[PDB]
Amino acid sequence: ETRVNPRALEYWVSGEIHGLVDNESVSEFKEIIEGGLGILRQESEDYVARRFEVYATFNNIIPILTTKNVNEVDQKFNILIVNIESIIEICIPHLQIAQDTLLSSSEKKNPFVIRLYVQIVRFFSAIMSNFKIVKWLTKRPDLVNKLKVIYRWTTGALRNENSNKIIITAQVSFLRDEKFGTFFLSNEEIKPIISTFTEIMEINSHNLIYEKLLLIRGFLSKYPKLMIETVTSWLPGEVLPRIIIGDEIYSMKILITSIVVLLELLKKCLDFVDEHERIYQCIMLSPVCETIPEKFLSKLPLNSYDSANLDKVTIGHLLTQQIKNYIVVKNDNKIAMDLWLSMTGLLYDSGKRVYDLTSESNKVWFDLNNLCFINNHPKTRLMSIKVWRIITYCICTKISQKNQEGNKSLLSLLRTPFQMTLPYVNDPSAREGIIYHLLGVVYTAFTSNKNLSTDMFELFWDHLITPIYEDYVFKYDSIHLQNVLFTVLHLLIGGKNADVIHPMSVIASEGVKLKDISSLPPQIIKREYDKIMKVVFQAVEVAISNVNLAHDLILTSLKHLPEDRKDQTHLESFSSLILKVTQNNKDTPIFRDFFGAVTSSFVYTFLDLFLRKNDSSLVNFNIQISKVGISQGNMTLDLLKDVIRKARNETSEFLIIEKFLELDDKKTEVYAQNWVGSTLLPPNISFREFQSLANIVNKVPNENSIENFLDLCLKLSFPVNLFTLLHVSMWSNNNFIYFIQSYVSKNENKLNVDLITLLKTSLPGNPELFSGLLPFLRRNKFMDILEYCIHSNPNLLNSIPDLNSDLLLKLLPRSRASYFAANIKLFKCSEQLTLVRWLLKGQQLEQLNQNFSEIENVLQNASDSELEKSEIIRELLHLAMANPIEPLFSGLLNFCIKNNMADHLDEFCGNMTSEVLFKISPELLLKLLTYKEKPNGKLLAAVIEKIENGDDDYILELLEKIIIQKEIQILEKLKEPLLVFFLNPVSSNMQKHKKSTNMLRELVLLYLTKPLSRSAAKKFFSMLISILPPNPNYQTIDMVNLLIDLIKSHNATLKTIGKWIQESGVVHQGDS
Secondary structure, three states, X not given: OOOOOXXXXXXXXXXXXXXXXXXXOXXXXXXXXXXXXXXXXXXXXXXXXXXXXXXXXXXXXXXXXXXXXXXXXXXXXXXXXXXXXXXXXXXXXXXXXXXXXXXXXXXXXXXXXXXXXXXXXXXXXXXXXXXXXXXXXXXXXXXXXXXXXXXHHHHHHHHOOOOOHHHHHHHHHHHHHOOOHHHHOOHHHHXXXXXXXXXXXXXXXOOHHHHHHHHHHHHHHHOHHHHHHOHHHHHHHHOOHHHHXXXXXXXXXXXXXXXXXXXXXXXXXXXXXXXXXXHHHHHHHOEHHHHOOHHHHOOOOOOHHHHHOOOOOEHHHHHHHHHHHHHHHHOOHHHHHHHHXXXXXXXXXXXXXXXXXXXXXXXXXXXXXXXXXXXXXXXXXXXXXXXXXXXXHHHHHOOOOOOHHHHHHHHHXXXXXXXXXXXXXXXXXXXXXXXXXHHHHHHHHHHOOOOOOHHXXXXXXXXXXXXXXXXXXXXXXXXXXXXXXXXXXXXXXXXXXXXXXXXXXXXXXXXXXXXXXXXXXXXXXXXXXXXXXXXXXXXXXXXXXOHHHHHHHHHHHHHOOOHHHOOHHHHHHHHHHHHHHHHOOOOOHHHHHHHHHHHHHHHHHOHHHHOXXXXXXXXXXXXXXXXXXXXXXHHHHHHHHHHHHHOOOOOXXXXXXXXXXXXXXXXHHHHHHHHHOOOOOOOOOOXXXXXXXXXXXXXXXOHHHHHHXXXXXXXXXXXXXXXXXXXXXXXXXXXXXXHHHHHHHHHHOOOOHHHHHHHHHHOOOOHHHHHHHHHHHHHOOOHHXXXXXXXXXXXXXXXXXXXXXXXXXXXXXXXXXXHHHHOOOOOOHHHHHHHHHHHHHOXXXXXXXXXXXXXXXXXXXXXXXXXXXXXXXXXXXHHHHHOOOOHHHHHHHHHHHOOOOHHHHHHHHHOXXXXXXXXXXXXXXXXXXXXXXXXXXXXXXXXXXXXXXXXXXXXXXXXXXXXXXXXXHHHHOOHHHHHHHHOOOOOOHHHHHHHHHHHHHHHHHOOOOOOOOXXXXXXXXXXXXXXXXXXXXXXXXXXXXXXXXXXXXXXXXHHHHHHHHHHHHHHHHOOO
């Protein structure tokens, strides 16, 4: 049973035994092959009776390529390679014979010979259609030169004589699957094969039409260049009219397949275009009867006129009518727009023919599209607006730019889908179609079109994008649609959040997605920035409710602002834009955050325009933003912080804070003081930043900021004069004080020029500041300042809170004590006591004179210390003896007014001078020596020393005073004034005689007001006359006569006194 021989005819029985029942993946295949050939090589009847069996066996034992079987098939195909020459020399003549015996005789087609022909053809196709053999043949030009002939014999066998249905089927399956021709056939050897397609045998078998259509569909994908070069023959022949005749005659699969041929043909024509316009000249230009053969013209449905006039009707006419029939009659929309699409692409993918879309007779196409779009099915609308992708491709990629008006009309036609979907905007499908078509337009016009430039980008943006957005996008209501389209805009200008090349891909079922858009590119942005922003801004103004899009659009818009365009205009434009964003919104925490980021990035973008001292644009802007915000102060502060963070290592924060202090917001001031007064101040600071910081401390000085600032000044690397930047004379008194203390203690511990100049002008005019710095300066000496202050403004001494008398004695006034003498009224007790000591010890006697009333007013009301008054008064009396003048003597009068002065008064009564005695006035001397005892009565010495041998009228004045005052106690002593009265004639005259007369009479008148003295009367009476020698002069006798007569008005001793009286009278008798 075993050992079935592989060769020698014992294997091949009649019509059976093919294998391989179980000889898989083994060289048994090889044996079956070689033995087979070893049978085909003989010519005996026994071996020729097994041809059909050998070729059926071959066609059976060849495996099919599976994804799990490739090494086995390759080994078997190598097995076929080894025997290639035997297969040539043997099998080619078998094909020749098997063909001639079938085509030579027009009738009597033999069945078995047909079997053999089919089997042989299938073997040869199996050896030509696949395998590495085509590669192996590049090493053997002879074998390919021998193989080429099969194409010739098939070429003749397709047009010659009764080729049976199965014969033609095998031939077209071979010519459909054959692959050797890829490498070894020239154009001139292929074109005849293509010419055969048009003219073959009669058919009407719905299997051969489909097989031929598959043949065409493979030939397009195999030799595209030649299939386009020869389209004029094969397309109007066995492909195109199949659609015009319709589904009545041919099954649906026929029509659909031929339409697919149109699609593939498009896929190929989009790579070469062809400059001969063969498709257009063939379909739209030439008549019907010119390009459709009679075979199909005799089966062509037509009306009366278009049938009687086959010269004015075109292929495109019938095709358009038939598409309309598929929409209206069949409702097979998909078929209709598949056609329509392939038609439009094949006809108008040439730049010359694109413009023909604007012609009137070519807008019937678009009307047809409308006929397909008004259907109720959502997917039908969506598809009818999706197929415009071909229009997008043709217009965008095949425009010439030259005819600007033609371009603008073509773009207006490209905006048609939006016109269609406008009234359907409430339907999701229409919206998805809008997004689809727009993305196709942007992709095919910008992202993929690598030839956009100055002359082009304007035509695209100003006549396609801008019209789309101004006419349609900004007017759609659903904020999700606006969200998507505006998102497209955001993705164009960089700043992408798209989650992530050839224009071709626009013509796809899924189309373009958002992830295939960015960028624009930048080099176009810098040029046409204004053009772009003229649309972006509108988008922002219409999408104020969609805060995210406004935030991202404004931010990534500023991020792409060129440096060469950072001027005032753009700044103000962004200002108006943001202001519109806030005006049409309400303050929510979210909008607070976003708006904060927008303002911060806006100020940071134009930073070098807000940081100039005289612009004030930052102030205006702050006023604008304060409208829509709760905590506006914290919006200013948060703005400062954010702008600082944006330029962390780009612009020093000091320069920002300086110009943010022109806003006078208290919270930014607090932040500035807290920042300067605690941050680390680097010694490596540049002068620009240092002067900025100095302006900060100058604007808002604080204790900590002064400390830290000066600690920086100690470590600088450049000279600097602080007072050209600080202007410390303007600060509050406290900050001034602390600046002085810190600057002194730290910088020098000593006063320099600038400090002197500052103090000599800021202190004399401020009593509070003076009282504040007084302890510090007092401790640090620096008397050249304090003495200057008192010299230029004495009233500072009144404003000293705790004015120590030691400090006052050391702070002599001192050059203009006249003011102090005049204004001593406005001072304190002990301070006056110690003050007058400067006038005394300074010999400022005149100042004590002209302002004596205030001095007596001071000493009047007592004081803290009375010993002070004691010494002061002692020196004052020394001055009273030195120079009488007048004031100090009124002061002596006031001393007499006070009783406690008794000690100093007696002192004065014991210290007299022969010059002062008559500068003394009587009106006070009387009241002085009357109401006092002997202590004051010791002044009487000089008094007597002037009574005798002195001045007449002063003595007479004293006597008149004591007379009119009636001071009886003093009159006891009269001997000396009586000696005067006796020796006072000299010149006499009635004036002095009457004077002495009256003065004597009245002086003796009140000598005793009550006669109760008893023996004293005797005592005095014995002495007052014991010193009376009236002998000299006669006018004395009158005086003595008055005396005696007055005595005669008043016991036993009075008689003796009378006798002595008569004695003096006798002495008078001796003078008469």
